[PDB]
């Protein structure tokens, strides 16, 4: 049986757009049914990297579990985690994706961060994150307290260093900045390491899954 996304896109559902909750949440499915112009997608505008490949990975799934990666706010005690946006409003109030967490300065500081997750399950884990591109210097400095921010994501078969640049884009859902979305599959037993000094939209929930097996 197929997974029915309702008014949500694959990106809206997997990121946890607050307007997306499946009517029927299941641990396995054969195909996904998505409507042609879904109303609820990347509510905070931005490019979703390798999106067609992600849709294919999620098209048929024999086991699926959404779980906390880096559990609780106590995983980020020296950053502010409560950032929300009018672009992802819910019930008349600014909100944010359920599966990512916007990290910004706290107490006048943005400390270097370095956080690891070890996949101690017997299934691969889909990890998603974002990299923020503010529209101007003032916004970049206000949130992250630097114009020289770097993000590093390293595992056994994946490494990428991001050097995010400012860019003023057309206003979409009130936003002239953008969040670019990224993902990778972490093999059982492997460890993923995030290091950053700004601009990281950190994983909050990740997904254990099996394909063709289960």
UniProtKB/TrEMBL annotation:
GO MF entry, a single one: host cell surface receptor binding
Subcellular location, record wording: Host apical cell membrane
Family statement drawn from the similarity comment of this UniProt entry: Belongs to the influenza viruses hemagglutinin family.
Membrane topology: Single-pass type I membrane protein
Highest taxon of the lineage: Viruses
UniProt keyword annotations, A-Z: Clathrin- and caveolin-independent endocytosis of virus by host, Clathrin-mediated endocytosis of virus by host, Disulfide bond, Fusion of virus membrane with host endosomal membrane, Fusion of virus membrane with host membrane, Glycoprotein, Hemagglutinin, Host cell membrane, Host membrane, Host-virus interaction, Lipoprotein, Membrane, Palmitate, Viral attachment to host cell, Viral envelope protein, Viral penetration into host cytoplasm, Virion, Virus endocytosis by host, Virus entry into host cell
Gene Ontology, cellular component aspect: host cell plasma membrane; viral envelope
Quaternary structure note: Homotrimer of disulfide-linked HA1-HA2.
Part of the intact protein present: 70 to 283 of 379
UniProt record, GO biological process: clathrin-dependent endocytosis of virus by host cell; fusion of virus membrane with host endosome membrane; fusion of virus membrane with host plasma membrane; virion attachment to host cell
Name of the protein in its database record: Hemagglutinin
Disulfide-bonded cysteines: 8-20, 43-88
Main function: Binds to sialic acid-containing receptors on the cell surface, bringing about the attachment of the virus particle to the cell. This attachment induces virion internalization of about two third of the virus particles through clathrin-dependent endocytosis and about one third through a clathrin- and caveolin-independent pathway. Plays a major role in the determination of host range restriction and virulence. Class I viral fusion protein.
């Amino acid at each position: 049986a197929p997974l029915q996304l309702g008014n949500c896109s694959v990106a809206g559902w997997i990121l946890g757009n607050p307007e997306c909750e499946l009517l029927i949440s299941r641990e396995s499915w054969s195909y996904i049914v998505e409507k042609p112009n879904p109303e609820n997608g990347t509510c905070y505008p931005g490019h979703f990297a390798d999106y067609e490949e992600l849709r294919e990975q999620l098209s048929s799934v024999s086991s699926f579990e959404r779980f906390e990666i880096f559990p609780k706010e106590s995983s980020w005690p020296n950053h502010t985690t409560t950032g929300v946006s009018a672009s992802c409003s819910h019930n008349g109030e600014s909100s944010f994706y359920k599966n990512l967490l916007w990290l910004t300065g706290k107490n006048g500081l943005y400390p270097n961060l370095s956080k690891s997750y070890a996949n101690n399950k017997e299934k691969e884990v889909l990890v998603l994150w974002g990299v923020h591109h503010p529209p101007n210097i003032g916004d970049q400095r206000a949130l992250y307290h630097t114009e020289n921010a770097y993000v590093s994501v390293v595992s056994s078969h994946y490494s990428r260093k991001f050097t995010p640049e400012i860019a003023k884009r057309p206003k979409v859902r009130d936003q002239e900045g953008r969040i670019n979305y990224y993902w990778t599959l972490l093999e059982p037993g492997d460890t993923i390491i995030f290091e950053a000094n700004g601009n990281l939209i950190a994983p909050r929930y990740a997904f254990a899954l099996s394909r063709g097996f289960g």
